[PDB]
């Protein structure tokens, strides 16, 4: 388990973790509680692995989009700030941190991508994506390049795939439809195809990743990059005269970055939920707290009403906010994990030449919507109705208690047959469940209660996956 009487904090290395640790050095001066701040790689995947087990950080930092996924698994403790503290932060930031009406984390800051550009190489950054091929030709002639940004992370190409109609899950009346993904429509194809053409024509390289982009830009080798607020600090240092402006349009449409609220949730299994509550309420979410972080890597548009007033006056922050308006706040639902992995795959495949745009986007389509599951599920429904059919057919007009548990399909795809009150019923384990194959010669168990109803818990304890 976590150690009682210290705070361990996980935040992304691209963020202002040294500012954060100075705020932690404030808490410690005061309370005598050591605060360690770390930045493991693949933080957002390492957290549910280790959290699942009663281990890992007290507090976790990330864009809100994966918090839905964490709360659904029950790994985040419910935060309970009082009214006076909720008025200190913007209503729309609490929204992003709400899952089933429950607040699952603290908002810190809004981040959205912008076009960042070298004012000496490009006093007039292009208004449109289509301008970019020609602009690269000119810059190649001067031993430079038009644009480099991270091609390995679908977050960065998203605004272009979204530009002209691509979308994650369709919003409709309060609710995201996870059955209606927007990854294989004409718009997405258009965006991606355009991006892939840049690569085919050598206006960009498919290898290019976060550190190659940052470095190239800060050395004045490329005219433009697409990054967020955290990136501004290293540019300050590089002394490259940079602007931050609106993202180029595509087919006359604004690019639509997915917008993240950076957020702090508390690990459910930590014996330090009160220390973490006092840390994040009285030390971090203060001007004094945020300022120390922002002066390390700019947060973007902060969630705290009183410090955002100052930061609002920065042209850079204005531009962050403008792009933010033209994009969309990320859904925080659990399926976000599957959507991002699907699009990451599609983009890289299309980029390397492994798969055309159609093929790649079709597969992401198929993966993102979890179509395999929907199809397996309907098969299992059918089969379970059929088993109900045969049973009733016999129990009636077949040759000669009123009190059964009725045929049911649980949330894992095991069909529990009509059984007698008092029965303990075994059914083989699922052959498949969420991407994983199980050894089917082991059993699940469910009890048909004496009163005619299925017990609500089902014993899946014996379903061992089979791997290697």
């Amino acid at each position: 388990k976590i150690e009682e009487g210290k705070l361990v904090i996980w935040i992304n290395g691209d963020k202002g973790y040294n500012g954060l640790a100075e705020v932690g050095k404030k808490f410690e001066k005061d309370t005598g509680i050591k605060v360690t701040v770390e930045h493991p790689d693949k933080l957002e995947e390492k957290f549910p692995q280790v959290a699942a087990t009663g281990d890992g950080p007290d507090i976790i930092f990330w864009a809100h989009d994966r918090f839905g996924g964490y709360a659904q698994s029950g790994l985040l403790a419910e935060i309970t700030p009082d009214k006076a503290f909720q008025d200190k932060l913007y209503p729309f930031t609490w929204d992003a941190v709400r899952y089933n009406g429950k607040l699952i984390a603290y908002p810190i800051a809004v981040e959205a991508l912008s076009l960042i550009y070298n004012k000496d190489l490009l006093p007039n950054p292009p208004k449109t994506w289509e301008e970019i091929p020609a602009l690269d030709k000119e810059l190649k002639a001067k031993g430079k390049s038009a644009l480099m940004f991270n091609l390995q992370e679908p977050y960065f190409t998203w605004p272009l795939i979204a530009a002209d109609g691509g979308y994650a899950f369709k919003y409709e009346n309060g609710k995201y439809d996870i059955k209606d993904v927007g990854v294989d429509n004409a718009g997405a194809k258009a965006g991606l195809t355009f991006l892939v053409d840049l690569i085919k024509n050598k206006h960009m390289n498919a290898d290019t990743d976060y550190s190659i982009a940052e470095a190239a830009f800060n050395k004045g080798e490329t005219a433009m990059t697409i990054n967020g607020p955290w990136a501004w600090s290293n540019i300050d240092t590089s002394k490259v005269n940079y602007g931050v402006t609106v993202l180029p349009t595509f087919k006359g449409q604004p690019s639509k970055p997915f917008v993240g609220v950076l957020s702090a949730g508390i690990n459910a299994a930590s014996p330090n939920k009160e220390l973490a509550k006092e840390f994040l309420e009285n030390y971090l979410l203060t001007d004094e707290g945020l300022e120390a972080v922002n002066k390390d890597k700019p947060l973007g548009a902060v969630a705290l009403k009183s410090y955002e007033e100052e930061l609002a006056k920065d042209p850079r922050i204005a531009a962050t906010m403008e792009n933010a308006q033209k994009g969309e706040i990320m859904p925080n639902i659990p399926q976000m994990s599957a959507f991002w992995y699907a699009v990451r795959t599609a983009v890289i495949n299309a980029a390397s030449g492994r798969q055309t745009v159609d093929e790649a986007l079709k597969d992401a389509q198929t993966n993102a919507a979890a179509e395999f599951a929907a199809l397996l599920h309907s098969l299992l429904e059918a089969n379970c109705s059929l088993a109900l059919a045969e049973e009733l057919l016999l129990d009636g007009w077949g040759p000669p208690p009123y009190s059964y548990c009725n045929t049911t399909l649980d949330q894992i795809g095991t069909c529990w047959p009509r059984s007698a009150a008092g029965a303990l019923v075994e059914r083989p384990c699922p052959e498949y469940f969420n991407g994983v194959k199980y050894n089917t010669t082991r059993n699940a168990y469910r009890e048909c209660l004496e009163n005619g109803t299925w017990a609500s818990k089902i014993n899946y304890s014996q379903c061992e996956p089979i791997l290697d």
């Binding site: 692995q49 698994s73 029950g74 949330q411 969420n434 899946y460």
Partner: peptide, 16 residues
């Protein structure tokens, strides 16, 4: 990937 996907399914199984 699969060693870890299965690790989430265990949680779901544990709950359900």
């Amino acid at each position: 990937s699969q060693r870890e996907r299965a690790e989430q399914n265990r949680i779901i199984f544990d709950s359900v």
